[PDB]
Amino acid sequence: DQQKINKFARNTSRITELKEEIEVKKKQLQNLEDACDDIMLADDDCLMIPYQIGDVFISHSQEETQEMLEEAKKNLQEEIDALESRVESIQRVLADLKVQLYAK
Amino acid sequence: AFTELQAKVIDTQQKVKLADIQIEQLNRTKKHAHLTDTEIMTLVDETNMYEGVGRMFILQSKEAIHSQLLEKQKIAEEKIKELEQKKSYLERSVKEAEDNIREMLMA
């Protein structure tokens, strides 16, 4: 082959993983968001909500069981952004590896 | 006639097979079921011995944990007879219908 041939193939395959991980971090953020509603939907201060930590479901008033998710939400949100522009970053290399294939 | 006498030799030869390895598996299951007793029996008294079947391991005292576990041995020892009994019976059946195939051919 060439080195481009080994690099150009590896880049598109390394474009693959980087776009993979951007995606997966929305739906927990969605379902954790969804879960913030479902605890809010029933039995809030009036009754006592276990928030699910592993198998130990921590029972309290309403606020934290949402805010618990929010903690699981906050980190997961801001992880999405780093791998976003990195596809954008690594595709530029690829789009740069694209023309590096043809000119020679 | 022959078809029903053909039908028993097929139904036997298929089902005679499994019981033969089924006794074999339980002879194995008798062992650890016994051996999982010795390993905690190795500790002469252990109450932080946890007898549990699956994921959960509940605290118990090794004693009844062993009383279970010689039975678990025995239980895993038991059906080998049945699983040998199931075995030996069918080989006797396949030739019977095989015979009334042949004798009613000859008659």
Added chain:
Amino acid sequence: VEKYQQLQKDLSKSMSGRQKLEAQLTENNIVKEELALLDGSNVVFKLLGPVLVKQELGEARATVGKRLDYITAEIKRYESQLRDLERQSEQQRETLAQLQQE
């Protein structure tokens, strides 16, 4: 030809989720028996979302009923989309088949 496939594709696609509803629907009935059976004898639990909420008996049955109902409605959702995605394939078939051919 690719145009024929997506319509076949989305067909069994949105067909997939619609079926397992019925087993859920089935167990939705299975729990109704038990939500009719439980007075709350032992703590009744909905779980929707990564939280496990405190659940009360009386709200659970109308829920699972709605859950039964909501799911039961969802046999119709794709059964609309069934013929939808089923049709657009067939239309292009004789064309795209012959298009594949010549």
Added chain:
Amino acid sequence: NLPQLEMLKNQLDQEVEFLSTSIAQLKVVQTKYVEAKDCLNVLNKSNEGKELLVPLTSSMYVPGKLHDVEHVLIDVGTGYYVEKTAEDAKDFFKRKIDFLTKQMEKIQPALQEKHAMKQAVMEMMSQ
């Protein structure tokens, strides 16, 4: 012509594979209901207050003090949980096995039937 008889043979091979898998798995899924059934006999036996070592997360196991042996779960509905009595929980375990049992059962009538028809195509094959 020639491929058509070649086609349906190993076709019916896999239905055997599939159904044998499905009964195997529907031999599997039933086994855990009695598990849920039997673990309740143990917790009744020793007592509420015995140390329970339950898994926490991957490779992690978490301890706890046993409580509420009469409070025991049946998972049913779509997403729903009925904790049940020590008596009741063991019942629907038994139930959902039996729901699975004929579910598991008819698989082998479906399992065994698909091989001989492959054979029937394999019979025509060497024919």
Added chain:
Amino acid sequence: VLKKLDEQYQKYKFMELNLAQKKRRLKGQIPEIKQTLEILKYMQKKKESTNSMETRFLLADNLYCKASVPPTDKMCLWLGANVMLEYDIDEAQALLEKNLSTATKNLDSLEEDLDFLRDQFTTTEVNMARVY
């Protein structure tokens, strides 16, 4: 000559993607043990028995016993080789954190070692397919 690069990029990419395959397996082992402590971490409350909170005991995937958890401060852990060992809240906090990046890195080099086997399988085969 086109005959060389052609037989090559094939038998580069065969073992190559195997490494992209054998790369991602081990970052797949991260979230197992990554999520572990976090569960224990939301659990760990220091100067308290870890898992002192409200719980519903997991007996199985059908049966649960809603129960009052609080044990001694320990986490019994899975070491493999059929030896469970009983750690405490910190060892656990340690043992399980340790197992995180050991999944992270086995990504890299296990991909890398055959990343020059992808080429050596290749270049051995390209002469092997041409001359034979």
Added chain:
Amino acid sequence: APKTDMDNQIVVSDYAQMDRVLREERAYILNLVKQIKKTGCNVLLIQKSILRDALSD
């Protein structure tokens, strides 16, 4: 709530779709139920479910 694909509000080709919006239908029909008793109805005349959309029992 209005009958969408049966008696109630569903949009799904997939369970994420159904599990998200299922929040909406369940809660409000309870509210519309609530307000009725809030409106001081000790008896309720419901004409036929064809003279109705329907009442989810």
Added chain:
Amino acid sequence: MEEEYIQQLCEDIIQLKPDVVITEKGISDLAQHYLMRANITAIRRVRKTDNNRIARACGARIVS
């Protein structure tokens, strides 16, 4: 257990010592086979009209 009931009746049949047993009610694929294993020819797939002819062939009746 299918074997025993055949025999215990076919031994009751043997109690009258046949070879030929023309089996009409209670015909079983094991019934003739046992009798064929008994080397008692068990004639099945047969009419009770024959057996009524046979009721007049031995002048007998047929036995429940």
Added chain:
Amino acid sequence: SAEQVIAGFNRLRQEQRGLASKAAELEMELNEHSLVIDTLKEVDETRKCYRMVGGVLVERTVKEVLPALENNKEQIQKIIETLTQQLQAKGKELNEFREKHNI
């Protein structure tokens, strides 16, 4: 006999692919052996330990753990190695005899 070389050549062309099929498989088993010895030598022997065996979690002293932990670990590597060995020692026949059979 032209069935030998094209089989042999391919059997010589197979195993260089077959390295990963072995290197991936054993690695799946090799990932486990690491957790076996290490956290042991990470943890003290001062405290209690368990052994997890059939239908029974046997509390077993760490002094029993190390041998149960370390010994069979050393033993497992022998067979898992020979495991994939015969996986690709079986195919060569399959590659040899299909040439003889299917020619």
